């Protein structure tokens, strides 16, 4: 199951999340039902109450990429949304639309200039089919602030334990997380 300790964090400036791109730098997953390892940056904006944001994998073991686009409201609570999403080529031609079974929903835990913490659970009907943390950083292999640091801690988590992408032989798309 999803982690169940996970509200926003409150009086974040929501300008510094909907900022430039992210580029994972580190990842937690609790269980992985696979051993591949991933990649991923993605580019959220809001209008509204609603975010939409395109979002890359690429599988560092297969070396392939995947591509999807996140639409979500946001909640009451501040910085946490729930997106259904589309899959898409990368040239964002959709292959399947967004359903009313999929779903991922998106905590963020800390934000500030140059990076972030954010919490997501993906939900597949009444299942959790995964939990995942994953700090980020504006620029690829850039390092990751002590304000966020130290939120990993905060979090009740060792960044140490986590999967650091660096050593992973990332590839990216830039031209597809542009806009
Ligand atoms: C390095 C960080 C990440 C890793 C390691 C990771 C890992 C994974 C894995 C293993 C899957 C299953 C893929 C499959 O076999 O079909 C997946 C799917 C998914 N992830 Fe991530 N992910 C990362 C970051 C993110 C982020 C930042 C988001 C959203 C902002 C996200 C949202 C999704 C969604 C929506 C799917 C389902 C795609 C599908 O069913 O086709 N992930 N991720």
Not at 51 to 57: D, G, M, N
Not at 122 to 144: C, F, I, M, N, W
Request: net charge neutral.
């Amino acid at each position: 199951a999803c982690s169940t300790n996970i509200s926003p964090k409150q009086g974040l400036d929501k300008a510094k999340y909907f900022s430039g791109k992210w580029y994972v730098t580190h990842f937690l997953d609790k269980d992985p039902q696979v051993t591949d390892q991933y990649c991923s940056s993605f580019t959220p904006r809001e209008s509204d109450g609603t975010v939409k944001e395109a979002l890359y994998h690429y599988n560092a073991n297969k070396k392939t990429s995947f591509y999807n686009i996140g639409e979500g409201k946001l909640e009451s609570s501040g910085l946490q949304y729930t997106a259904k999403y589309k899959t898409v080529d990368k040239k964002k031609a959709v292959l399947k639309e967004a359903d009313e079974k999929n779903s991922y929903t998106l905590t963020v835990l800390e934000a500030d200039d140059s990076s972030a913490l954010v919490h997501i659970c993906l939900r597949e009907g009444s299942k959790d089919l995964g939990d995942l943390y994953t700090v980020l950083t504006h620029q690829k292999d850039a390092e990751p602030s002590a304000k966020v640091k130290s939120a990993v801690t905060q979090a009740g988590l060792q960044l140490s334990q986590f999967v650091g992408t660096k050593d992973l032989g990332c590839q990216y798309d830039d031209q597809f997380t542009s806009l």
